[model samples]
Target: NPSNSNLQALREELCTPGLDQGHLFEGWPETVDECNERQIALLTDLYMFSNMYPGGVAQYIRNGHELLARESEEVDFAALEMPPLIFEAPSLHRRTAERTALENAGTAMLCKTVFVLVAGGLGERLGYSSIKVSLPVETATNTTYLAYYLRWAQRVGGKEVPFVIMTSDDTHDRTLQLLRELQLEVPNLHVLKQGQVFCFADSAAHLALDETGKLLRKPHGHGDVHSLIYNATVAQPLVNDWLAAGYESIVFIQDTNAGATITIPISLALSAEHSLDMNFTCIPRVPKEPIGLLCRTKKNSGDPWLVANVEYNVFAEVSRALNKDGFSPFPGSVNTLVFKLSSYVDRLRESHGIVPEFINPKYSDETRRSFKKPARIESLMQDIALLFSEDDYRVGGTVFERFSYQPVKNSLEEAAGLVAQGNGAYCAATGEAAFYELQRRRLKAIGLPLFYSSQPEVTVAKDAFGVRLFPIIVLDTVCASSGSLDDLARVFPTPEKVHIDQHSTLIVEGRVIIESLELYGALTIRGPTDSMALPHVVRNAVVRNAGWSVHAILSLCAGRDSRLSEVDRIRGFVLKKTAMAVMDC
Candidate 1:
């Protein structure tokens, strides 16, 4: 009962002289016999990993022990070479991902593109109890994030475009359920579920077990995303389909990112515009910022360019080269990458998720004999750069700060508190705040008579960093989709009579013209968008709330809006359409 029923059989299969291995199962779960088929296979796989690898799992434990005990202090800076970088959309904007010309070009190229969404995540971390993609990207529209991406895909192309999602055991079923609920019967949409790896119990790689005695397993990380894409074993593999369909590019993005709707076209346009084989969309970084640096290494100009991520842990070991702006020469990467699919297929085939895996063990004691907890051999998706030798490899980089700004992670309050301490956070509150304020600035820049009637008194919170709030404003893709603000300005030609007070929430999801308007309450204009039914609006009603409705306390990131029921909406306290009229087309 203490060992797996097949443990003895496996030992015989291995032809072990003693029907036993040196401490391989010493700390393993004693109730292996209780394991079911799934757990049994996991146990068998671990044994196979040990039997197959030279010197077994013991070598892993010993090596990890030595490293954890600081027995090896390997530090070499001379070999660390920062790659060449460039400022993309260089003329129109430095770090912003906006340029009407680029958006137009990029959208035209969306025909043969496949978007790979790395969504192997759970929202338990963000205090929501669902798949992160199920969460809404904004308040004006309760559109779930997956819906957002799907809608973006729908804009320029037909169902022929492939949109794949990489999921895990934890998220696979629920993701399907979400699609079912949304009635998203997309023909070309695919969700690939990557398997998990075993966890180690000690230095010897004694496979860990859950408290219930089932073999323990954890995610293999986002790197498996590459393997799942080209895996021929899957019937009708996505890569095969893309190649058959003459798809030209594959875009890799995180699921929780809201800014991709803006940054993606920019990156996609750049990929085609410059013909970059591996395009890394990056953002500017400040000193001591821990975001991975997208660096490339070319072997003395004789070798092809190899671009990849240098983990922040290794940064202190390398020289901190700063440019004139006092920022790092290399830009920060949040793992958003693009690859020209035509050529990337060959590279993907050659590598097949073969990123060099590393082990990180936390020793329970200084002797490094035991583990505080088990760890797994993990790989990063960014490590694909290591596999390319020469063979037409053209690695490139681009910088966009606001273009890729909002990544929803922390809770509003938790994020705000962190900001109160001068720390940066990517919370729902901050994301909502950033989206509104950023759009407001864009509107103003586009020659709109938009100004903050409210003083510099947004009380967006702390100094330089904190949620900035103006009037709650939402400009749907319908207005800014093509990136021509002049086009947007044309519809609102009579803005002189338009005045949205400092405390109003204005939402324009249509092509309605705004003539005379004094909005003190929440006003939403939806429809026509020029179905030739362009409605002209005039408003003087007071749509004021108790203030909290519009985040009464602008600093409250928590009570802003997390989404769901009216109770949920009330909890966040959003702007409601009250005392606001319409019906004048």
Candidate 2:
């Protein structure tokens, strides 16, 4: 009953002799009764994709089959011409700097912008079974990547502005569920579920089928985000609604990184302040970095536009030429991009050609298979780099450093490193550097532990006067410039009490416990708590004694008030089995 007349017509149009290469139904279940509901539902969805493109799916398969059968070589970059480059720098000298004053414009621009988060990736490589943003990389702060973005939106606008999350079939439901659980009551938040396509088998001109008789489907790349935004049945109405609400700019940010610091704010401000049509924030690329270089290029017809060297191998000659000529041609790589709503719509309307297709082999089945199939005809976010001709609108770029981009791509180890880095800026008002830490403190102030972590138990409490104590409690500790607690753990297995003074070194050995244990001086450790142990509760009391050393300690446990300042040094104090006393050296 769900199948209407138009749906049948669309199916016929897709399966007609020349349009479909007899592959659409190659391994389809023999009867409707034989197919499970999931298979049937998925097949119907695939049909919807094919319906949108007409003969597009078949064309992708035919072209891919032909290309695979023939031998191809790397592109000859020698033929192409390299475009000119420019650097955005500050040039004001003493007199000019004092004389020049730039006004703080676009204070009201915050209300005129909406953020688009491309959160469709499954993040299979990162070992996440759900949406990538849902991964709890920073356990100490108890926040996911998605939560960070939501907080960013709230903070920047001072209110919930229009926020759009572009999700895929694999991530939509999970992402929606996550937002609900997060209790993010965002204003005009739109979750657009992009469509998926079936992969084509390499052996034959047929749709790939998994062992369970279900068609192997994959989500199209983030480029589909553009198509979805403009497509009538998908997100066009939502876009219209957002525009009607005076939101004039669309800021596209990948869900992986912490772009809030430099990328998002700078690009949005630049776009609004300069009235630029499109602006992208590029991070300077170190040598051997594999990200696409943001460059300017021109077509054979003399029209020019900004382009990302995603197809760099094809233009390596240009890359090398710029390198050889003592010119820093490509200064950075792109992650954040901006578009004025009017300009974006105008360009979409002016573009009048069928989209070019590219073949990408992907893991279509749950079980690992031998030869991967041409998964889906897709587009890249970088493809939009060439969308606007130079004459169409004002396009620009800005550059930043390592602090802006923290993309979590690899394993938990990589994620752990990024999480440990925290948010890039320190908030003087709150004495917080990380967004997660800020949220943790907030939750703590509400008399609830955001969550708990092993290895080091940190309890933070802040007062109205901005005085806060973030006591990081570890089972065992060491004395170094912020070294690991591993070595210090050996002697003080059941030991307690550690007070780290501001900028101080702490060292410990043997079973040592005093009424109050405190440390002082320069201490900083990297990757100390990398491997978090199982969650456990810890009872603790604050110890403020500082500028001291301990050697061979006893039992150190006390209630609230304990004054150990009377003792200058604690050395070779042995435990007497039951109750212990503070021994002076």
Candidate 3:
């Protein structure tokens, strides 16, 4: 197999220059601090090269080759320190002592729960009803997939921890609705939405309708995380909140897979172990998985620069030929794991955007004779992974167990039914539970009290606070909490009795309470024993059993931090340590 031969050839030549130790930092004024000077010069030069000449990144191909050849001989490549935990593996069930230790560690351990990034899709793929978040993957248990993921987040203290989901314009409303339903009873699931997108297609102009009334759109490749960060609240506001809330880590993962979704203990431990700009699980190269080609690249100063697989076919060649010792340049790519939020924030602030894109050959169906995969130049998210090369030592790689990675990609051929089955199974298993829980908690978070009606077979948690909140159900549009005049007239038979103020009563187990408030037509609260299925009118008019208010806030906030800052910056600033904090207190 042809190796990164061009880079290797160049690395051999730059191995002669010893550290000048006093080169002026490229981006800023030269510092008197020798160590700071060197670090700044190296990192700054990388930053400038990447950002300023992004289109011409291939220029670095030649630079990379030269740097590699020279650095190979001068530096003791063999003696270089291995990444911490290159081979360290921890079982899913580890030491009880370690667990207890982490509990004491507090915010750091819990940081894993706060920063959540969801890989939601645009509305075009799924119908208007086929929301990416709500797209049901029927599990064996009949639970929805989002339910399973939410349940895991609940278990890990992510419920109400203030997180962000990377959503698309087409899917934002649907995603929010799904999240509310799913986390209804889960405490403190303060979720904000960021988008994983580029300006042209992601922008308003791109989404504008053409003559046929369809959105005009062309999404840039996912590699635009740099742009995503630059455009959205994440880079500044979100990171600021994470920093303020004392959440030390950020957990990034795609939403499609249940297995790749959570590695609670290991992620926590990794965050504790290495506080680096970036840290994530990377498996050793397998023969066929799509991961960046990792190998030693020589630099101009005669040092090894950790490089990534720039593209698929180019790296397919790299994968074909093994070194004499069977060392393959490919390192497996698993897009799951924990990151140090503050560290990334600082790194980005330091560099200002140096990540570049690679130009690769793309062939289309028009070009292929058979039904072959299309070839096209595409930028990817992992380009962010490559920026770690700018400061090689700061980039830490922790190999995750094979079980931890299960990415759901765009194509059916690659991820295909894997995500479908997994997603369906997950939703069916936990779907209902998530809906009830998320709704309950969200209401509770906003300071609404909940009164449960158990006379019917299904639970009906009513708004004790008597606000505008809706009675949202799992996997159903069967709403019990809307007073819109039109909605009321259609659902209610005796419209006058469905009062908007005072004296509304439909009870099973001895409860009659009245608040001086407005109610509406078609409004019915029912018992837990009643069948969940009935006419929409019947379900709307019935009220269920009397039960104590669960102290919904207590139930929701008991498990996690009410610290809004842990989840989002704008809300964090607006809520915690300010007006919202005073009210919470």
Candidate 4:
């Protein structure tokens, strides 16, 4: 029905081809007097969407598509000296209908966010891996952290949202080529290079050598996030326009956990509802949790900010000064949160420089024309988030009633290890839960998962990212919502009976532990299979515990705390093993 209306509008707008010769000479304007009014509107909408970007930028943008739809006056684009980009009303109607089909069915826009992977770190910790993002995992899939983030982005944003992968000198080219080889299926994934390492920090000789004989280069913290983000203007065309078109609100998170990228709408609703310009969605923190501490500046300001754990030594005494009211500004910590674009832009224009840190890398060869000493640094972009508190930015936060904040830090030992393991295990549990929920109900099924399938058709709104899905658990769903609850009640609703997407494929395999179905290219298995063929042209093989065979590890689940009874049986065993390892050390 929606398609019919759009088709009708398209038909009414087009100028009959045979009679348009003279008009073509004089400029076959989109809003011709001969065309029906509705058709003219549609044509204008398409023109705006297509030609809005200078280069291939708008295709990488979705918000512009929406902004173009909200027009009132007939725009004189020529006055603006913009390129003459015309959209055939009929073509536009078709594309618009196609894109909005899911929305028309029942999904709502919850949140709009930008996921930035800071690729500026040295991969010194991960033995042998030269790049941080390229570090391989312990699983059979042999997936790296970067791949995890890509999968997570596909999981959270679906395939249509905007995800900018920012890599520095070390990871840029590899990141791009990897995306092509590994994540080409992910749509509109914008690749960007961050500010150069030398731009923000000086060379190695700037550090004071300690007793350990190591070069400690003063490195700036992530607060210089704007440099890399702003530098993106040179390559990423859409970001510049996004800033222009009022696409405000963004949620920035580190790509450490693919599972932390799930969807939850209530948290998004609260963010929009409260008009909270600067909000840090956080979870309860334990002593070992390396999350930033949400604290107040000493000046009694009514703004928002959190002191990071990296700089905890500076505020250690301040944190210790907490009364019985649960640590003055609240003991919670931020994994990631939403940001108001306009607010940040204003702050960027207002501030001189952000907080800086002195970093010391282990390796150094003292020969370079450009190298400063004790590099002046800025905090992580999140660090300046605290500036909001100083600026009296309202801190709107949500304490997830039933979710755990899982983060992957330098150490996965004890609590950190537990967090990582908890996240991986949760994916498996969620899949099982979803299956159970669907077991009793008869619902129309759409895209199913497939082996080697990078991304199926998934579209999520911004607000839905980084949400706590349960009184039972917290989850980071993708930005794409098709068959989810958001589709029916939020984006599409009027019609319950839907014309499901034929192109959509199953997404149950990648992030979830239990899958009802599995397909390896041409071969389809009804239940589940330990072995499946990927769609790649040349299949690679591997031998494992069983007979030799081709294998690829897609998703993995590690249940660390499945049951206390089972854990008790291995408790002494684990401790004894640890003790033996320590003795050897």
Best of the candidates, TM-score: 1
lDDT of each residue in 425-503, candidate 1, tens digit only: 6766566666666666656655555667433333332443434455767655554343344545654566566777766
List model 4 lDDT by residue over 1-585, tens digit each: 224344334433322332121221233333356555444554444334223222211221222223223221222111111111111111101224432332332123322555556665453322224455554321212356677666555544555556666565566677776766664576656565543222112231121322342222222344555544554453444555556644555566654433233322333445555666666555544454335555443323332233322333333444344333222234444545566766765665555323333333222345442434333223466555545543455555554422333333332123223444442222222222222223112122222211122221211111111111110111112212232433312211221322222221122221112112211111111222111222111112111111111111112324454432222121111111111000000
User: Which residue runs of candidate 1 sit more than 4 Å off their true CA positions?
Assistant: 1-77, 90-98, 123-125, 232-236, 298-305, 317-325, 363-369, 412-421, 453-466, 477-499, 510-520, 528-548, 552-585
Our tally of clashes for model 1 stands at: 5
Model 1, residue 381: C-alpha shift (Å): 1.6
Instruction: lDDT for model 4, please.
Output: 0.36
Q: TM-score for candidate 2, please give it.
A: 0.60
Worst 10 residues of 4 by lDDT: 576-585
Q: Residue 178's C-alpha lDDT in candidate 4?
A: 71
Error of 3 at 213 (Å): 12
Query: Model 3 off-target regions past 4 Å?
Result: 1-87, 93-108, 111-113, 121-132, 135-143, 183-216, 230-236, 260-262, 291-304, 307-314, 320-331, 351-354, 359-361, 365-378, 389-393, 407-585
Error of 4 at 164 (Å): 2.3
User: Ranking by lDDT, best first?
Assistant: 1, 2, 3, 4
Residues 331-392, candidate 2: write the lDDT tens digits. Answer: 55555777888787666555531234455445556545334554555666656756765665
TM-score, one value per model: 0.78, 0.60, 0.46, 0.47
